[PDB]
Design a protein around this ligand. Structure first.
Ligand SMILES: O[C@@H]1[C@@H](O)[C@H](O[C@@H]2CO[C@@H](O[C@@H]3CO[C@@H](O)[C@H](O)[C@H]3O)[C@H](O)[C@H]2O)OC[C@H]1O
Ligand SMILES: O[C@@H]1[C@@H](O)[C@H](O[C@@H]2CO[C@@H](O[C@@H]3CO[C@@H](O)[C@H](O)[C@H]3O)[C@H](O)[C@H]2O)OC[C@H]1O
Ligand code: NAG
Ligand code: NAG
Ligand code: CO
Ligand code: CO
Ligand code: CO
Lengths: 434, 434
């Protein structure tokens, strides 16, 4: 796609701290951009939609190439259309925003300049942020994560994409998402099927795959940390059901691991660690700090701070594994006890290390789940299982929770706030901000 | 040996904090006891010495069993004879103390009760302490470490030892030390050879071996962190040169690894990290905090705090190893690049994990080195090597430094102070003391 300017594009600014081993931190100035899928897509020569509801224009978009030639992405009114605001080092995303139309959530990338994404090399480093999840009920996911995207959003590889990072192109993740309207500078109209339950989305004949570090997927009830390896580290197109992932016939039939080696303290047995109010170790009615450390062995370490009190990731015992570090032994034990072979099939933490050794882009989002109602995060899943099935219970939410139309109607004012992002060598981010 | 009471034994009290995963710490009350080798050893029935200078009484001690039957250990005047004082959570050890006789240094164990040692299980936990090394010049070693000693100092296994932990019996370490005057409730007079350069010590026909975690061996110039595995985890007697260790003919001819997998930031190339004054990351003229974390994989992590600024162990690159965690990959790379096979021969971190999974006793000491002048810690070693030999340079001290008689004469007022000991789950010890 190209870019149009019927609506101006002003990326909300966002600062973050880069820390060094010598003990100081210095402020960096970036901004955030909304993903292309949230944008208005129209003809280059007029205001006629190329996509509306969950249908493509059959005249403007008769095939993937003609569509990309005819169509452009336009600018975003971040606050009034999308409920996205920033203030200094803080970012807020509202759940439902009513303007001329209803918008649900957002997916945002941290930028280095108005036309390029910021890349972070996670290996050997740590990432710290503060989050307020108090206004996230069952069925919602305020997510902070990394994906192996190109810094230009794909322009250099796909010259029919001229919109680029400035317009939030080039997304990929470990679900090999096929809901993307543009992949590799083409549209995704070929093979398009509208969603049976979502007026605004569908699934096309192509998907976009890459490695994904899910640092934080959470609401006020449950939180999870999950690396997802792919056999191709960076962004790569996939074809139809060969994509695998959530929306293909076989989620395991592609190049990425859609399940991941997940660590949810509640799922692992500590049902007192994280939740709303003073009965939990971390009180999710209050802001908390989350620090994630990527040691060079490829293992991941985690600690939290709330009201000046520090807590390592809680210990878990699973099969022959015992500890609080997300390492090979944990992931192997998890597969043995909870089931599955996707993480190990895709190369486990060794393959994942190839992603964290390279550059990844920071993503912050808020979403509800039109496939599985977020039950995999915060409820019992699958819903016919009981607590006697190892790993079935992931949180205290009812198996009836998270119906998107219901939570959109009942909780439109839900929101997530991410703040005080700090990045640098392991051990450096607790030092004073500069 | 038995215990005598011509001199009373009052263990200086010492408090420390036990922290929990839930974020609080509570004070514990213990005390310290001086090792048996520093004590007066005399006939049970009189004040006649069984040992004097570096010679045993040939009449009282004609053999190991008769000696133990005839002889007892007596009490210690901690401050006036040994230069050992405590105040709350702080312990100070002076280098040379002149009373009726000259005393050099001390080795002390933390007690649980007046008759038993405190045991710590390191695996899954972390140990934090503050240290002032400002008054430790080249050639000195203020050491804080753990060894796999019996809580009773050997009494249950060796009933001819009735003095016990109360009198500092039962020492062992990864050098399989043969300088001990009593091992396994026997004397060590058989095979005794006086030291050629130390008026107060010698080497006997038996040694005492066990696993050793050298958390801290340091002065104002250099510091090292070193696990030492043994093929028998806990305390075990050894015979003559079959002991291996520093003072046997072949240091590698026994059951312990006397070299260890050492991590000295200066040796590894960072010559700016630790030293006296503002030109170093950690200024050794000032108190610093040292935290050591024993993750369940068997790897060891380390960070430091000084003036509220936190520093992970500095990164090192050695062969194919890169990082700051002391793990299998580091220890293997160290052997490949610096030389040696002792650590891996004795089972490496896997064997070492058996020690940290069990109980170990806390040791604090101050010593000078009558074998190698502490050059292995703070100078170039061996002394004919140059900086072009990988790992030869371990600190900035002259290869002429550390002659015991010289440093004892020039620096008698040297001292080390250890304080604010805190122990608990990984991530817990930075929380407020209780
Ligand atoms: O025509 C434009 C609309 O299409 C646009 O609607 C937004 C489309 O994206 C929606 O978010 C989806 C949520 O799930 C992700 O997986 C999808 O990729 C996203 O597309 C968003 O809720 C809609 O508001 O709004 C502007 C119109 O001009
Ligand atoms: O007779 C008693 C003396 O023997 C005693 O002297 C102390 C003996 O221990 C000395 O410390 C040695 C240092 O190196 C360690 O490896 C040794 O095991 C220790 O023995 C200490 O410096 C001497 O003061 O003092 C009291 C006398 O009654
Ligand atoms: C030494 O370590 C400190 C602390 O990590 C680091 O900031 C510095 O760059 C290192 N210097 C060298 C020469 O390795
Ligand atoms: C949950 O984790 C916290 C923090 O480590 C710990 O203090 C608590 O004992 C754990 N509870 C359970 C049930 O595992
Ligand atoms: Co195709
Ligand atoms: Co013997
Ligand atoms: Co580790």
């Amino acid at each position: 796609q190209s870019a149009c300017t019927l609506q101006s594009e002003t990326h909300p600014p966002l600062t973050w701290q880069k820390c060094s081993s010598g003990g100081t931190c210095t402020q960096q100035t970036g901004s955030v951009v909304i993903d292309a899928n949230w944008r208005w897509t129209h003809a280059t020569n007029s205001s006629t939609n190329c996509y509306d509801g969950n249908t493509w224009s059959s005249t403007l978009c008769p095939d993937n190439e003609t569509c990309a030639k005819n169509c452009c992405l336009d600018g975003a009114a971040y606050a009034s259309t999308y409920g996205v605001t920033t203030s200094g080092n803080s970012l807020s995303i509202d759940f439902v925003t009513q303007s001329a139309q209803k918008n649900v959530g957002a997916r945002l990338y941290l930028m280095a300049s108005d036309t390029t994404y910021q890349e972070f090399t996670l290996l050997g480093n740590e990432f710290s942020f503060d989050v307020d999840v108090s206004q996230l009920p069952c069925g919602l996911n305020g997510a902070l994560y990394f994906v192996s995207m190109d810094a230009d959003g794909g322009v250099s590889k796909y010259p029919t994409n001229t919109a680029g990072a400035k317009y939030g192109t080039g997304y990929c993740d470990s679900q090999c998402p096929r809901d993307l309207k543009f992949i590799n500078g083409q549209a995704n109209v070929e093979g398009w099927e509208p969603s049976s339950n979502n007026a605004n989305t569908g699934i096309g004949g192509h998907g976009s795959c890459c490695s994904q570090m899910d640092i934080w997927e959470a609401n006020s009830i449950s939180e999870a940390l999950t690396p997802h390896p792919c056999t191709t580290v960076g962004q790569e197109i996939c074809e139809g059901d060969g994509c695998g992932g959530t929306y293909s016939d076989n989620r395991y039939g592609g190049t990425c691991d859609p399940d991941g080696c997940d660590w949810n303290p509640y799922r692992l047995g500590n049902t007192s660690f994280y939740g709303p109010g003073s009965s939990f170790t971390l009180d999710t009615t209050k802001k908390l700090t989350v620090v994630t450390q990527f040691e060079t062995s490829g293992a991941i370490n985690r600690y939290y701070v709330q009201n000046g009190v520090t807590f390592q990731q809680p210990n878990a015992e699973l099969g022959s594994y015992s500890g609080n570090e997300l390492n090979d032994d944990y992931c192997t034990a998890e597969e043995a006890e909870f089931g599955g072979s996707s993480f190990s099939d895709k190369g486990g933490l060794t393959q994942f290390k190839k992603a964290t050794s390279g550059g990844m882009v920071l993503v912050m989002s808020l979403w509800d789940d039109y496939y599985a109602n977020m039950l995999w995060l915060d409820s019992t899943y699958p819903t016919n299982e009981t607590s006697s099935t190892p790993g079935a219970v992931r949180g205290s939410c009812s198996t009836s929770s998270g119906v998107p139309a219901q939570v959109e109607s009942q909780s439109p004012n839900a929101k997530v706030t991410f703040s005080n992002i700090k990045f640098g060598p392991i051990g450096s981010t607790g030092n004073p901000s500069g």
